[PDB]
Structure formats: C-alpha cells, structure tokens
Curated annotation (Swiss-Prot), chain A:
This is BAG family molecular chaperone regulator 1. Co-chaperone for HSP70 and HSC70 chaperone proteins. Acts as a nucleotide-exchange factor (NEF) promoting the release of ADP from the HSP70 and HSC70 proteins thereby triggering client/substrate protein release. Nucleotide release is mediated via its binding to the nucleotide-binding domain (NBD) of HSPA8/HSC70 where as the substrate release is mediated via its binding to the substrate-binding domain (SBD) of HSPA8/HSC70. Inhibits the pro-apoptotic function of PPP1R15A, and has anti-apoptotic activity. Markedly increases the anti-cell death function of BCL2 induced by various stimuli. The chain holds residues 140 to 224 of 345 of the full protein. Isoform 4 is the most abundantly expressed isoform. It is ubiquitously expressed throughout most tissues, except the liver, colon, breast and uterine myometrium. Isoform 1 is expressed in the ovary and testis. Isoform 4 is expressed in several types of tumor cell lines, and at consistently high levels in leukemia and lymphoma cell lines. Isoform 1 is expressed in the prostate, breast and leukemia cell lines. Isoform 3 is the least abundant isoform in tumor cell lines (at protein level). Homodimer. Forms a heteromeric complex with HSP70/HSC70. Binds to the ATPase domain of HSP/HSC70 chaperones. Isoform 1, isoform 3 and isoform 4 but not isoform 2 interact with HSPA8/HSC70. Interacts with NR3C1. Interacts with the N-terminal region of MAPRE2. Interacts with PPP1R15A. Interacts with BCL2 in an ATP-dependent manner. Isoform 2 does not interact with BCL2. Interacts with SIAH1. Interacts with HSPA8 (via NBD). Interacts with HSPA1A (via NBD) and HSPA1B (via NBD). Interacts with SIAH2. It comes from the Eukaryota. Ubiquitinated; mediated by SIAH1 or SIAH2 and leading to its subsequent proteasomal degradation. It comes from Homo sapiens. Residues 33-80 are annotated as: Interaction with HSPA8. The modification Phosphoserine is found at residue 84. Residues 5-85 form the Ubiquitin-like domain.
From Swiss-Prot, chain B:
Belongs to the proteasome subunit S2 family. Component of the 26S proteasome, a multiprotein complex involved in the ATP-dependent degradation of ubiquitinated proteins. This complex plays a key role in the maintenance of protein homeostasis by removing misfolded or damaged proteins, which could impair cellular functions, and by removing proteins whose functions are no longer required. Therefore, the proteasome participates in numerous cellular processes, including cell cycle progression, apoptosis, or DNA damage repair. Component of the 19S proteasome regulatory particle complex. The 26S proteasome consists of a 20S core particle (CP) and two 19S regulatory subunits (RP). The regulatory particle is made of a lid composed of 9 subunits, a base containing 6 ATPases and few additional components including PSMD2. Interacts with RPGRIP1L. Interacts with CRY1 in a KDM8-dependent manner. Found in skeletal muscle, liver, heart, brain, kidney, pancreas, lung and placenta. PC repeats lie at residues 93-126, 127-163, 164-198, 201-235, 244-273. The modification N6-acetyllysine is found at residue 235. This is 26S proteasome non-ATPase regulatory subunit 2. The gene is PSMD2.
Length: 85, 290
C-alpha cells in the first residue's frame, strides 16, 4: 500500500529523482516522510533544513504536500549544510 | 520567460534553456577554457605599488569582478570577519556583493548564503536576503526558491530587512510578470508603515517585475499610493521611484501615456513635471521620437 510519488530534489549542484512513499501511516507522502528521507540521505535537521516547492514556504510540519500540489515531474529545492555529527 | 504547456515536444529542455539553468554552467566552463577564472583581487586592480567606505568600495568592485562566478574566498572563508570589521551601513552591500559573485548560481549560491541568512546583524540579514534575490535574478527556476525563501521578509516590519527582500524579489521576478509575485508585492506597496524610500523600492520592484506589461492594477496602486502620501513629504528626495515604475510598466508602448499623465495631472508641479516626463520618455524609449 505504498503511495509512491516522484520528486526531483536539488541541492549543492546535486540532483536526485527520488521515488518516495508514505511510511508513517499516512495515505499520502507528507512533510514528516520527506524530512525523514532527507535526513536519512543527508542528515540535515528539520530545524534548519529548507524545502522549497513552487515558491511555497514549508513552515508547517503537518501540511500534506501531496494535497499542496506535488505530482510526478515536480522539482523541489533543498537548502542547508550537510552535517556529519 | 515564456509560460507554456508541456504538450510540446522536449518541453523540459525548452523551459530549462529558456530558464538559463545551463547559463551558469556554460559560462563557468568557457571562463575556465579561457583560463579567466582566477579571482582578481581588488588590490592589484588598484595597483597599490605606491577608510571604511574605501574598503566597502574595494569589496563592491571585488564582487563586480567575480560576478556570476561564485568563486571568491575573500567573502566566503573570512567573509564574516570582513563584515564584522566593516562599519555602519555597509554589511548589507557586502553581502549583496557576495550575491553578485553568486548570481545565476542558484544551487551554489543558495547553499553558500544560507549560513549568512541566520546572521545576527539586521543589515547582514537584509544583505543576505538581497543576495538570494540577486542569485535568482535573471535565471529562472522550476520551483522558484526566491518566493519561498522571502516569506516573512517580504512584508517584515524592519525597514532594512523588508528592503532587501523587496529588492531581491524585484530582481528575481524581473520580466517574469508572475501573477503570484505581483499579488504578494503590491500589497506590500500598500503598506503605510514602510518609509518613503521603502515605498519607492517597492515601486522599483513592481516596475521591474511588470516591465513593459501595462499592468493596470500596478499603476492604480502606484497612483493611489502617491495620492495617499502627502505632497510636501512626497517631493523631498525619494518619490522619484514611483514614476520609474510607471515608465517600466508602460515601456515601449506609448500613445496610452496620455491617460496616465491625465490621471497624474492632479499632482503639484514640482513632482508632476518630473513624473510625467519620466514615464513619457521611458514609454517612448527606443523609438526615435525626436
């Protein structure tokens, strides 16, 4: 019952066409799921990481981006510094 | 930027090359091929073989020389020390000069300006936000990071922080003619708490965003803001940006300017005689109308 969706993350001249799916019991991928994937891939904490989609700011952690308008072929921008604790 | 549908063939490449995404990569690649990549120090440009403002000018020319490159360790490694050593009002321009170094470098510029975004001084923060707008200026992006990055600063109460974001959005959305950007910056134009020069910068941003578009609501807001502002405080030294926005919005059109000047006829002579002439010449630019 994985709700897969294709997003194009771009940051620091590095781009990935991730096929992410909802994992935390949600019917659709959400900010928590995307933040978890970003933290697993890179490790930027949710406090200072900046995800940008269509010029819309990500401030609410519980706002579903699938309802906000992410579809296949959409691209998002990741802003931050790769932290290696 | 031409806004179209994906039904056309190879649409992803067409919008990318229209967005100048590969502009920066090709420009750096050719610069390396010419071997013209070494960051030219402002000092040996000055030929010093034989001061706060002078140091600021040195920082600005360094950003001018290294513009569109993104390769300058002078403001990157010890940049924080330089702005800390800098005095008074120049930290905003130094950070904006750093954005000039990183202009058209969306991916590289945003990461190297994110650290300076959380700076302590308001001028450094405003300069960092202006640096972001310079970075995204000209080059178009699919997700348009400038709009989301400048969210609280677009209408922020602090004058300097609002000035940097507004100028950054103006440079970013310059020629985009985006309805969302216009519907978010024009309400900022309608703010009364902002200073006279802040209102002028908003008019400058609106003018460069809607250049050559005859945006009716932009002109109505410009005229309404002029009417609401008192004439005595209008005509001092900073209202000269409102006619500039009008001229940009009607750039290269002509003829219809009679309506704008007729509506502007109510203004008193010292500023009306300046505003009507500016909008007329900007609209009739590149026409040979002797």
């Amino acid at each position: 019952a994985a709700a897969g969706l294709t997003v194009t993350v771009t940051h620091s001249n590095e781009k990935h066409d991730l096929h992410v799916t909802s994992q935390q019991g949600s019917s659709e991928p959400v900010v928590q799921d995307l933040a978890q994937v970003v933290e697993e891939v890179i490790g930027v904490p949710q406090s200072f990481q900046k995800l940008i989609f269509k010029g819309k700011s990500l401030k609410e952690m519980e706002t579903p981006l699938s309802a906000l308008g992410i579809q296949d072929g959409c691209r998002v921008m990741l802003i931050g510094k790769k932290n290696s604790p | 930027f031409l806004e179209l549908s994906e039904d056309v063939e190879e649409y992803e490449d067409l919008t990318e090359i229209m967005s100048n995404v590969q502009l920066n990569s090709n420009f750096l690649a050719l610069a390396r091929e010419l071997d013209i990549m070494e960051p030219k120090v402002p000092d040996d440009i000055y030929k010093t073989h034989l001061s706060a403002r002078m140091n600021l000018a040195s920082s600005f020319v360094n950003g001018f020389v290294n513009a569109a490159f993104g390769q300058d360790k002078l403001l990157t490694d010890d940049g924080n020390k330089w702005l800390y050593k800098n005095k008074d009002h120049g930290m905003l321009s130094a950070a904006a000069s750093l954005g000039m170094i990183l202009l058209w470098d969306v991916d590289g510029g945003l990461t190297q300006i994110d650290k300076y975004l959380y700076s302590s001084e308001d001028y450094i923060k405003s300069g960092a936000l202006l640096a972001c707008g310079i970075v995204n200026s000209g080059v178009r992006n699919e997700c348009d990071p400038a709009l989301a990055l400048l969210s609280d600063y677009v209408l922020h109460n602090s004058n300097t922080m609002r000035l940097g974001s507004i100028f950054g959005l103006g440079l970013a959305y310059a020629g985009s003619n985006r309805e969302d950007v216009l519907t978010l910056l024009l309400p900022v134009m309608g703010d009364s708490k902002s200073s006279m020069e802040v209102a002028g910068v908003t008019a400058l941003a609106c003018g460069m965003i809607a250049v050559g578009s005859c945006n009716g609501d932009v002109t109505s807001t410009i005229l309404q803001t002029i009417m609401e502002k008192s004439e005595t405080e209008l005509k001092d030294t900073y209202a000269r940006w409102l006619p500039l926005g009008l001229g940009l919005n009607h750039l290269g059109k002509g003829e219809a300017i009679e309506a704008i000047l007729a509506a502007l006829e109510v203004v008193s002579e010292p500023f009306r005689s300046f505003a009507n002439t500016l909008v007329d010449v900007c609209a009739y630019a590149g026409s040979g109308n002797v």
